[PDB]
Write a protein that binds this ligand. Structure first.
Ligand code: ADP
Ligand code: MG
Length: 300
């Protein structure tokens, strides 16, 4: 498979420093993190002060190209509550430097569209949420328990978009709709998955050569138990382990999430998983857990 895992350590936060937490994360080359003297090796390791643009360039840039070249793809942020998942995928949406993966992907995609000649494009976006193994449409709050059919989500809103501005507006709209019938936003968002889909259609007007690529950009529920592992996250660990083994059968049916992502995760699809970590001594075992999860994808 074409699954890459990259590990991102964020800085110690204010509140970790108030306790006398130490920085337990040690670094060996550009692909290795060391914790309690155990090495953990990934496709890349991002140290605490890594810029938002370096994470983009290594995690995501090539997958855009592959989408524009007609492949499907997935990028995930996985990790503990407060580990940096949302900072990685979204970050400061409108800030040229604080911008996370999604808004950069949208900038690159359009830099390619606008730079073309006989090529015609249709780009459409969907944005939904998975909570308790159920799908809610984040663009239409009247659609709360959507079903997955043979791979598409029945009834999901799809919006045609002509500029990155309309994409970002669609995300901000989504982020706001997500508060509907939710009492506690952080709590809920750390307990659910948010999934953004860019579908990029191209037709060469003079050659009738058509291409389509889907890109799912997923900010996953928090990885630490709440007393089981979140259901989509166990499905996903099992899909990854099976791809890692080169199993001919992949248990996509283990969750609605891995059923939607079936044509975009494994096989011919491209996949980066950004595992996010806190460097704090306080979180040593959850971090170990996050690394362990990251390693399921190492081929055997
Ligand atoms: N690489 C980083 N650099 C600076 N601050 C960060 C970084 N990652 C996370 N933070 C901050 O720590 C807090 C938790 O990040 P967030 O992405 O909200 O965590 P999560 O989505 O994993 O629960 C946020 O306020 C975020 O701004
Ligand atoms: Mg978050």
């Amino acid at each position: 498979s074409n699954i890459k895992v990259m590990c991102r350590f964020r800085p110690l936060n204010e509140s970790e420093v108030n306790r006398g937490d130490k920085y337990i994360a040690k670094f060996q080359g550009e692909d290795t993190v060391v914790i309690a003297s155990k090495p953990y090796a990934f496709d890349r390791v991002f140290q605490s002060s890594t810029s938002q643009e370096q994470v983009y360039n290594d995690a995501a840039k090539k997958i855009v190209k592959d989408v524009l070249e007609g492949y499907n793809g997935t990028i995930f942020a996985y990790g503990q509550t407060s580990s940096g998942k949302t900072h990685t995928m979204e970050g400061k949406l409108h800030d040229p430097e604080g911008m996370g993966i999604i808004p950069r992907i949208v900038q690159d995609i359009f830099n390619y569209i606008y730079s073309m000649e006989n090529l015609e494009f249709h780009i459409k976006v969907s944005y939904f949420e998975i909570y308790l193994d159920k799908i809610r449409d984040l663009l239409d709050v009247s659609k709360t328990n959507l079903s997955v059919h043979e791979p598409y989500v029945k009834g999901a809103t799809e919006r045609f978009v002509s500029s990155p501005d309309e994409v970002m507006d669609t995300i901000d709209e989504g982020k706001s709709n997500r508060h509907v019938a939710v009492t506690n936003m952080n709590e809920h968002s750390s307990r659910s998955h948010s999934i953004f889909l860019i579908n990029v259609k191209q037709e060469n007007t003079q050659t009738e050569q058509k291409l389509s690529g889907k890109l799912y950009l997923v900010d996953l529920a928090a990885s630490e138990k709440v007393k089981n592992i979140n259901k989509s996250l166990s499905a996903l660990g099992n899909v990854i382990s099976a791809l890692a083994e080169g199993s001919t059968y992949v248990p996509y049916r283990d969750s609605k999430m891995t059923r939607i992502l079936q044509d975009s995760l494994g096989g011919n699809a491209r996949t980066t998983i950004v595992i996010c970590c806190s460097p704090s001594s306080y979180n040593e075992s959850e971090t170990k857990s996050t690394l362990l999860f990251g390693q399921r994808a190492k081929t055997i």
